[PDB]
């Protein structure tokens, strides 16, 4: 999270760390959308051109998570996938589309003050909210500055929060040069806007949950996918249309859990 601030105990109880066992480490984050189901970027699980490619066994998942360092002794969680599930029309090849993947928590987690689910949109909500200028908040433990490295300026101690506006679809196609599909959306203030923040390295898979003024709920409007850097006056992150693909999302849940 480029230009953001440190979280607070309980403010995103659905943020999970995609921590591989050994090289004991963290590739990303995801979100709690069931008793036992977690969803994320696909790039976060299957990237060939960098021969990224994991399996249940490969990874282990953690929850209850505030400090990105330690061992959250009795507020944190962890279980390993029972099965990972990607989306059979994903473009790691072209622009990384349908950048979505889900994982049937090998076993089920029981929620608390520190672990609690996120709800998925409905065209209604998918549509009152997914609009130019209406901010959304992105979290994680990702890289405080463009791909570089420092318990400082590299990565945070604790969980990073940023809230960003949606970008007029036109303007979005003119930050990049990548063939952007009606399935991806862009966040982040303008050059001129005079304020900055963004999502960075290992922020990926990390959520784009917004809050619906109708029912005071938190709706995972997005899923972190890409950028051409970190906090460029001139570009906007690109997130996944969690609702466009809400279709699929359903099928695998209702067919394997």
């Amino acid at each position: 999270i480029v230009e953001g601030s440190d979280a607070e105990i309980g403010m995103s109880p659905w943020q999970v760390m995609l921590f591989r066992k050994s090289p004991q480490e963290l590739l990303c984050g995801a979100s709690l959308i069931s008793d036992r189901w977690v969803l994320t970027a696909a790039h976060c699980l299957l990237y060939p051109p960098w021969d990224k490619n994991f399996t249940e066994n490969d990874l282990l998942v953690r929850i209850g998570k505030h400090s990105r360092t330690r061992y959250e002794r009795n507020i944190e969680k962890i279980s390993m996938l029972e099965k990972i599930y990607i989306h059979p029309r994903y473009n790691w090849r072209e622009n990384l589309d349908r950048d979505i993947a889900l994982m049937k928590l090998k076993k089920p987690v029981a929620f608390s003050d520190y672990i609690h689910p996120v709800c998925l949109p409905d065209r209604e909500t998918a549509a009152s909210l997914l609009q130019a200028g209406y901010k959304g908040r992105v979290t994680g433990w990702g890289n405080l500055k463009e791909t570089w490295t420092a318990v400082g300026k590299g990565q945070p101690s604790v969980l990073q929060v940023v809230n960003l506006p949606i970008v007029e679809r036109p303007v979005c196609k003119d930050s990049t040069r990548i063939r952007i599909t009606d399935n991806m959306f862009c966040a982040g203030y303008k050059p001129d806007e005079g304020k900055r923040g963004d999502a960075c390295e290992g922020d990926s898979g990390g959520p784009f949950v917004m809050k619906s003024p109708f029912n005071n709920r938190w709706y995972q409007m997005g899923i972190v996918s890409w950028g051409e850097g970190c906090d460029r006056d001139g570009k906007y992150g690109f997130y996944t249309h969690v609702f466009r693909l809400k279709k699929w999302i359903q099928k695998v849940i209702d067919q394997f859990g």
Binding site: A41, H43, C44, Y47, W50, L96, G142, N143, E146, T147, W148, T149, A199, C200, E201, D203, S204, V224, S225, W226, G227, E228, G229, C230, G237
Partner: peptide, 10 residues
Amino acid sequence: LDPRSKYEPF
């Protein structure tokens, strides 16, 4: 291509 990119990470 994830967000720091083409070429692989640092």
